[PDB]
Design a protein around this nucleic acid. Structure first.
Lengths: 351, 7, 351, 351, 7, 80
RNA sequence: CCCCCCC
RNA sequence: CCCCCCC
RNA sequence: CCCCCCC
RNA sequence: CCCCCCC
């Protein structure tokens, strides 16, 4: 039946149209430098508002992929969003050090006042820091560093790993893991508000689901490159850590098989190994894209659910609990007795 | 004054 | 033959359904505080009626285990009782010290009038006590003490230890042992009616046999905890003292073997040691759950009976009588001559 | 039967939840210095109130282990207490010697007024001492000494060794042993009120049982360190002296076997050596954690009781009394004649 | 002059 | 010849845990049989299978500073 | 019920 | 039928 | 995030 | 309905 359901959903001759009247912003790749600065100015100052930080990270992704290629990506994700192009505008009478008009980015959907206040706060912060110490600011502590967009996107990828969880657990995990993983950045930029940037990224991934696809493409485009920076390797590492998100019971069942839990041989589970095998066969049929089903928020996700095999699920959760890897996982345990017996056996095996 | 005892 | 009878009873493909149309009450764990107060208000006032004290103790057990887990326990005991959930209701126009409506528990099967009268009598008693002495009531003499449910359940466990006895012997034993064991509680709460609470618990264990299972689970859940209170350690101690209840002849026969009673070598007993050994083999086959057979009131209990070996039973009772441990045990002595000879030898050995 | 009871209690599939709505305080390790000062300010002044000294010692334990690791410890002890984090707050207009605002610790559950009065009394005392003598205060007589938290925790460990005793005996033992063991500290800090600090620690170990576990972890974490101070070695020495607490009859029975008391061969004891051996087998089965059962206040404790072997207990107590090691032990002697004969033989052997 | 002691 | 010798000495740079795990297998360390490691030998074998799939260019992944490097990490098998 | 000394 | 003491 | 020795 | 841990 599960293969039949997959063949029903997959073999559809009609595509679905959504977001027909909507628009979204991209930035041409030729403005990468100009976006890089902005991605670094959200980092080294303390801002009252971090609403559009995730949008600026997506703008950097657009510059790294290309505006037309990003439009193609958003079309292939199944969305009719009309890409809009970022425009550089002169601030006004204000002039830069080179004697030209100070050109700032104009992003669609982002109020220009937000960009002005981010830039002004960053400039004020650096003015204060140079007032405190003279000549003590190397390149790596400046907003114009090429990897600052990657640092912002690494906070975004940390919040991306927890997209099948809730907002509170995701935020706590992102802050906790960013204190360690993004430690060099936090030393270079001692005042980037990781909780607020993470909340911005969670928001962006909620309203603009197609951007998830864009995010994924960036990872795909970034792990295919011959070279890269350290921050890009970190981004790809977190992006792979996001892989099997929303399907931890499949991984834990593979563990319970590798753990040789004897309670897998209980007749109640034995009556379900056939449908369990069908679920894993479905994973094999879907292939490498099956891991991204929940990250993409595919409607097809849920065919990979083992929730109709309650005894196998109970034994898998019990084996995970005995080994001590269950953590604070909140999956429901239908069969309590199988859970207890599996947990006892797994604890005995581990000891 | 019986129902506001601390207990 | 005894192993064959055990294999007959144990290897049954059909479960038995009972209590199909009935319901029982539980309290969600989030109301533990609210039940704790009630479990302390039966303790520090003199009440005309103690009918539902055992029910309130079971409600605390439900809060400590969880309403859904308690439903699972009652299902696994072999009962179709439909759990009902305790609901907090406002008393009415009456308001508490905090300026909110006074919320009281509504337990299924317990008339609300009983709860109102228990609460009103407890409030009147504390008002009188504070009228007598000002500021002389510490936390440990208040109903809101966290261990008051455990004190109630310790009286219940005392009556649980004597569930294979009669009601009169059980009540006398509970009062006598509670005067000593629950002495700190009786100093803190000088007016808890132990006989009436014990009669309530005996009643509850008579009508609702499945609650025995619930009681047992509490002990199992309580002795598995890393920490606990002193009252909880006392509860587990009495609960272990209840273990081999209904099977004192097996323990006394192990004693008579350890006492090296020569009358065990009498040919009449020698003709029965084979079936005696089969009974002990059955105990080994059943395992740790064999001790709870009479407490659970399992129909399977009675396979552990040594009543078909009258001469071994007579020698065991005589050895116990000679050592002076027989007490007022009312087991029947089939062979009087073997009893007399065994008792004479055991007295000679002890002297 | 005893192995069966242990297998009943140990092999439980359901954990127990307690302290669900409660909270407790910890201090992040980065505030260790700030807590050290406080742990030294309870030491060198005479305070009217010593209520929270044990809490400050636990705060130092939290800084030494880590707030998140302490939360994990308290969870694994079986408690749902919600860790709260210590916050440094500015006192107000008051400024320190460095020209910054005087930052003081804010611990959950500890009134800030208590901390203010401890700090103010300590500052007044040192001001008076420097008024008496100029430049006569070395580092080792200052509250900021790194080992002052360890001195406080050594008083706590002295009261910990006597946690199976009563409060009066424990306090007397702590004062008597602290006059000798903590003599260098009492010379450095001539006005630390050991009785009041010991009463504070006894209180803390009464209300917050999970903190016992925390205490134990500290010892485990402290004896595993490659290096340490002298005070830390003293703490571990007292912590090992606390090991077999609540099980002195097992140690004294091992002594009575090593003493070759002939009354062990009396037939009444011989009838009980089988269950005695079962108790020691249970100790072997439990392993190294069996010694901490009474210190942790485990409900499982009491399976290690030899109280059902009255004649062996009488012979063991008599052998201990003859050797003169019984002291003022208050264990009950069921068999007086066996006690007298064992004591006579042990005295004859010792002479 | 009580709050600037070295300690 | 000296240049090529040092250049080969640079080969498995950044992947010394794979070489040391091959050593620990060749050393017949009995603690490899501990159940905690046994629960991870499957992913360890997947890492070595990835090395075999990548082929001779897998050794230069860290020298080239390839973003693909880090797939060869055994950091998710802490007991091994 | 358990526990209870000394270091 | 079983069970029945004491802690 | 990864990485980290020696030749 | 699904999902839910950790890195």
């Amino acid at each position: 039946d599960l293969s039949y359901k997959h063949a029903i959903l997959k073999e559809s001759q009609y595509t679905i149209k959504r977001d027909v009247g909507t628009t979204t912003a991209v930035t041409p790749s030729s403005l990468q430098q100009e976006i890089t600065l902005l991605c670094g100015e959200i980092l080294y100052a303390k801002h009252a508002d971090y609403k559009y930080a995730a949008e600026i990270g997506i703008q950097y992704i657009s510059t790294a992929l290309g505006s037309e290629r990003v439009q193609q990506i958003l079309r292939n994700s199944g969305s009719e969003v009309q890409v809009v192009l970022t425009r550089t505008y002169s601030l006004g009478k204000i002039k830069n050090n080179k004697g030209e008009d100070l050109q700032m980015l104009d992003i669609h959907g982002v109020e220009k006042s937000w960009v002005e206040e981010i830039d002004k706060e960053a400039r004020k912060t650096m003015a204060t820091l140079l007032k405190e110490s003279s000549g003590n600011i190397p390149q790596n502590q400046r907003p114009s560093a090429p990897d600052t967009p990657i640092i912002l996107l690494c906070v975004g990828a940390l919040i991306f790993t927890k997209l099948a969880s809730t907002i509170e657990v995701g935020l706590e995990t992102t802050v906790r893991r960013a204190n360690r993983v993004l430690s060099d950045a936090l030393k270079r930029y001692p005042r980037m508000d990781i909780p607020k940037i993470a909340r911005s990224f969670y928001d962006l991934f909620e309203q603009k689901v197609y951007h998830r696809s864009l995010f994924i493409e960036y990872g795909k485009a970034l792990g295919s490159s011959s070279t890269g920076s350290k921050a890009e390797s970190l981004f790809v590492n977190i992006f792979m850590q996001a892989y099997g998100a929303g399907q931890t019971m499949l991984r834990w069942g593979v563990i319970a098989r590798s753990s040789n839990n004897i309670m897998l041989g209980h007749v109640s589970v034995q009556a379900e190994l056939k449908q369990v095998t069908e679920v894993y066969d479905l994973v094999r049929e879907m292939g490498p894209e099956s891991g991204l089903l929940h990250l993409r928020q595919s409607p097809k996700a849920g065919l990979l659910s083992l929730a109709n095999c309650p005894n196998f699920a109970s034994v898998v959760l019990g084996n995970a609990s005995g080994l001590g890897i269950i953590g604070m996982y909140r999956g429901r345990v239908p069969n309590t007795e199988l859970f207890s017996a599996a947990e006892s056996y797994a604890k005995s095996l581990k000891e | 004054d019986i129902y506001q005892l601390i207990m």
